[PDB]
Ligand SMILES: CC1=C2C(=O)c3c(O)cccc3C=C2C[C@@H](CC(=O)O)O1
Ligand SMILES: CC1=C2C(=O)c3c(O)cccc3C=C2C[C@@H](CC(=O)O)O1
């Protein structure tokens with residue numbers, strides 16, 4: 001004994017890290033916990049519900065600095081890199097998250113902290129409220145593409161290079177970047193773009 | 204009956220999509236609708252996965268990428284995005300389909316060519332132009348998805364608003380903005396942020 005929600009969640013996360021999402025069935029989980037379905041459902045509900053809890057549990061891995069003046073740009077980037085670290089350390093997690101609710105204790109307080117750091121930058125509400133949404137969406141998407149990946153890049157990269165340079169001039173000349181941009185490079189590139197935009201729209 | 208063509212196949216599939224949604228689109232359902240055998244259907248379009256690439260590419264014709272007019276770069280970029288957004292909103296389950304798919308194709312590639320042309324015409328260096336295009340279309344697709352997904356806002360707004368203001372000042376103060384910002388308001392904010400940043404990087 002005995003089944004707790006937190007104990008169920010750590011177990012489901014344990015097997016997600018090891019063997020990935022599709023190997024996370026309620027049956028497998030129930031099997032690991034050596035318990036009956038009934039007790040499992042009562043605690044975490046169904047699989048969507050379980051994922052939700054798993055998503056929230058790993059959010060503690062994300063660190064949101066307290067705002068230092070002079071340092072907003074860099075601090076927001078820290079937060080974002082922290083979120084990406086979480087995604088990279090957890091198989092299939094970005095897949096769990098890009099759909100679902102940070103509406104849970106850990107996500108709720110992480111929001112508060114995130115909103116605090118954003119507003120401190122002189123962003124205004126709509127801008128702060130949305131910016132946080134934008135950054136989160138950005139990081140999650142970039143992380144989904146990362147874990148997604150090979151040679152596709154290479155077959156695609158070459159496919160574009162072969163284009164009739166007379167009709168598809170830009171494509172041939174941009175074939176490289178389009179296809180095979182360093183993951184870290186894309187992240188940092190997108191990070192700067194969004195951050196500069198937020199500042200531009202603050203003042 | 205007239206000999207099956209790829210385009211008639213694909214138009215019909217889009218019709219089922221639009222009316223009935225992604226999950227009602229099967230090769231069996233499409234065969235029914237077309238009154239043809241599974242061989243001639245497959246001959247033309249392959250499996251469901253391939254069918255979807257074709258459906259996606261055919262709708263891209265609805266998107267308009269202006270030829271660069273000097274003076275108006277920033278606004279023409281927003282124009283292109285609004286048009287791409289329009290297409291998603293006009294088409295059910297589409298943003299979902301686009302989420303794992305390379306536009307590449309007749310219009311797909313043509314519109315990328317035209318997009319990179321607009322981007323670089325703004326003084327964006329190869330790498331900003333290329334990524335900016337990716338970031339821009341990823342942003343539009345994600346907003347579309349979101350918009351389609353959608354009382355809940357009032358429930359969430361109620362919860363955030365009724366929080367201990369001493370514990371969650373920001374979540375209580377930003378209760379509304381967070382809960383719901385029309386899809387239009389979100390979209391434009393997101394556009395101006397990204398376009399301003401592309402300009403800063405250039
Ligand atoms: C859940 C959570 C966070 C977030 O959800 C988060 C985010 O969604 C987007 C961008 C940044 C963050 C940061 C955090 C930090 C985290 C801290 C905690 O709950 O202990 O709490
Ligand atoms: C391929 C294509 C387009 C695009 O791909 C596109 C885009 O990717 C992002 C934002 C806007 C657009 C617009 C178009 C328009 C269209 C080009 C054409 O075939 O005429 O078809």
Ligand SMILES: CC1=C2C(=O)c3c(O)cccc3C=C2C[C@@H](CC(=O)O)O1
Pocket residue numbers: 141142145301302306336337338340341344
């Ligand atoms: C969602 C997505 C893309 C697109 O959807 C896209 C598009 O819809 C029309 C024209 C071009 C594109 C390009 C992309 C690139 C990529 C972005 C990402 O997943 O980060 O994955």
